[PDB]
Design a protein around this motif. Sequence first.
Motif, PDB file in Angstrom:
ATOM      1  N   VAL B  16       0.834  -1.199   0.000  1.00 52.94           N
ATOM      2  CA  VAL B  16       0.000   0.000   0.000  1.00 52.94           C
ATOM      3  C   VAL B  16       0.870   1.250   0.000  1.00 52.94           C
ATOM      4  O   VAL B  16       0.597   2.214  -0.723  1.00 52.94           O
ATOM      5  CB  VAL B  16      -0.969  -0.016   1.199  1.00 52.94           C
ATOM      6  N   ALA B  17       1.923   1.257   0.817  1.00 46.78           N
ATOM      7  CA  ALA B  17       2.834   2.398   0.850  1.00 46.78           C
ATOM      8  C   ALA B  17       3.495   2.612  -0.509  1.00 46.78           C
ATOM      9  O   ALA B  17       3.513   3.731  -1.044  1.00 46.78           O
ATOM     10  CB  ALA B  17       3.886   2.197   1.942  1.00 46.78           C
ATOM     11  N   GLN B  18       4.034   1.539  -1.095  1.00 47.54           N
ATOM     12  CA  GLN B  18       4.645   1.669  -2.418  1.00 47.54           C
ATOM     13  C   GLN B  18       3.635   2.081  -3.484  1.00 47.54           C
ATOM     14  O   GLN B  18       4.013   2.731  -4.465  1.00 47.54           O
ATOM     15  CB  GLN B  18       5.333   0.367  -2.840  1.00 47.54           C
ATOM     16  N   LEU B  19       2.363   1.720  -3.315  1.00 48.88           N
ATOM     17  CA  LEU B  19       1.346   2.060  -4.303  1.00 48.88           C
ATOM     18  C   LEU B  19       0.933   3.521  -4.178  1.00 48.88           C
ATOM     19  O   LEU B  19       0.649   4.189  -5.180  1.00 48.88           O
ATOM     20  CB  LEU B  19       0.146   1.128  -4.140  1.00 48.88           C
ATOM     21  N   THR B  20       0.883   4.034  -2.945  1.00 53.34           N
ATOM     22  CA  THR B  20       0.735   5.469  -2.735  1.00 53.34           C
ATOM     23  C   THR B  20       1.899   6.207  -3.380  1.00 53.34           C
ATOM     24  O   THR B  20       1.734   7.293  -3.946  1.00 53.34           O
ATOM     25  CB  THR B  20       0.657   5.807  -1.241  1.00 53.34           C
ATOM     26  N   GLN B  21       3.092   5.619  -3.290  1.00 51.21           N
ATOM     27  CA  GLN B  21       4.258   6.188  -3.954  1.00 51.21           C
ATOM     28  C   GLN B  21       4.072   6.244  -5.467  1.00 51.21           C
ATOM     29  O   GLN B  21       4.267   7.301  -6.078  1.00 51.21           O
ATOM     30  CB  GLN B  21       5.517   5.391  -3.611  1.00 51.21           C
ATOM     31  N   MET B  22       3.696   5.123  -6.087  1.00 46.70           N
ATOM     32  CA  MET B  22       3.646   5.074  -7.544  1.00 46.70           C
ATOM     33  C   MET B  22       2.414   5.796  -8.086  1.00 46.70           C
ATOM     34  O   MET B  22       2.556   6.868  -8.684  1.00 46.70           O
ATOM     35  CB  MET B  22       3.687   3.620  -8.032  1.00 46.70           C
ATOM     36  N   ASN B  23       1.214   5.255  -7.814  1.00 43.85           N
ATOM     37  CA  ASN B  23      -0.081   5.750  -8.297  1.00 43.85           C
ATOM     38  C   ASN B  23      -1.157   4.668  -8.301  1.00 43.85           C
ATOM     39  O   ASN B  23      -2.331   4.966  -8.060  1.00 43.85           O
ATOM     40  CB  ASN B  23       0.004   6.321  -9.718  1.00 43.85           C
ATOM     41  N   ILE B  24      -0.778   3.424  -8.587  1.00 45.74           N
ATOM     42  CA  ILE B  24      -1.732   2.325  -8.743  1.00 45.74           C
ATOM     43  C   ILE B  24      -2.525   2.174  -7.448  1.00 45.74           C
ATOM     44  O   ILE B  24      -1.930   2.193  -6.361  1.00 45.74           O
ATOM     45  CB  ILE B  24      -1.014   1.018  -9.126  1.00 45.74           C
ATOM     46  N   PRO B  25      -3.866   2.040  -7.507  1.00 46.39           N
ATOM     47  CA  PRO B  25      -4.662   2.034  -6.269  1.00 46.39           C
ATOM     48  C   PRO B  25      -4.285   0.929  -5.295  1.00 46.39           C
ATOM     49  O   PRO B  25      -4.058  -0.221  -5.682  1.00 46.39           O
ATOM     50  CB  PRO B  25      -6.104   1.870  -6.778  1.00 46.39           C
ATOM     51  N   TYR B  26      -4.240   1.291  -4.013  1.00 46.52           N
ATOM     52  CA  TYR B  26      -3.781   0.415  -2.936  1.00 46.52           C
ATOM     53  C   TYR B  26      -5.004  -0.182  -2.246  1.00 46.52           C
ATOM     54  O   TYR B  26      -5.433   0.250  -1.173  1.00 46.52           O
ATOM     55  CB  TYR B  26      -2.902   1.193  -1.963  1.00 46.52           C
ATOM     56  N   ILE B  35      -3.480  -6.282  -0.997  1.00 45.99           N
ATOM     57  CA  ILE B  35      -3.605  -5.325  -2.093  1.00 45.99           C
ATOM     58  C   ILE B  35      -4.175  -5.974  -3.348  1.00 45.99           C
ATOM     59  O   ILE B  35      -3.915  -7.149  -3.632  1.00 45.99           O
ATOM     60  CB  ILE B  35      -2.246  -4.652  -2.378  1.00 45.99           C
ATOM     61  N   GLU B  36      -4.973  -5.214  -4.093  1.00 44.44           N
ATOM     62  CA  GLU B  36      -5.498  -5.627  -5.384  1.00 44.44           C
ATOM     63  C   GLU B  36      -5.390  -4.478  -6.377  1.00 44.44           C
ATOM     64  O   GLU B  36      -5.664  -3.319  -6.055  1.00 44.44           O
ATOM     65  CB  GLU B  36      -6.952  -6.098  -5.263  1.00 44.44           C
TER      66      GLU B  36
END
Lengths: 41, 51
Positions: B16-26, B35-36
Motif C-alpha cells: 500500500v505504501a509503495q502504491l501510494t508512492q507510484m499511483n496504482i490504487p492500494y 492489495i489488489e
Amino acid sequence: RVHLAMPSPSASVTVTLEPGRALDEGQISAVVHLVSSAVAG
Amino acid sequence: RTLFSNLSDQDGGAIVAQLTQMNIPYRFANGSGAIEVPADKVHELRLRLAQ
C-alpha cells in the motif's frame, strides 16, 4: 553493521542494500577491502 | 486478481505504501487487507515487490 575479532583477526559485515539494487562482484570488494584495511593485521 | 494467496497484513501495508508512492490504487482483499490492482499493473507490481 561491522564486527571485529580482536584477540587470527577477522571481520563480519551485515549490509542491507537499498531495495532495487545489487552490487557487482567487484563491488562487494569495496566494503570487503575497506573493513579489512580499516583493521590491523 | 489472486496474484498471491492469503498475504500477511504487513506485506499488504508495505505494498500500500509503495502504491501510494507510484499511483496504482492500494486496495484490499476479502477480510485480509491484501492489495489488489488492475490486470495490467500486476506484472509491474510484482516487479516492484521483487525490487
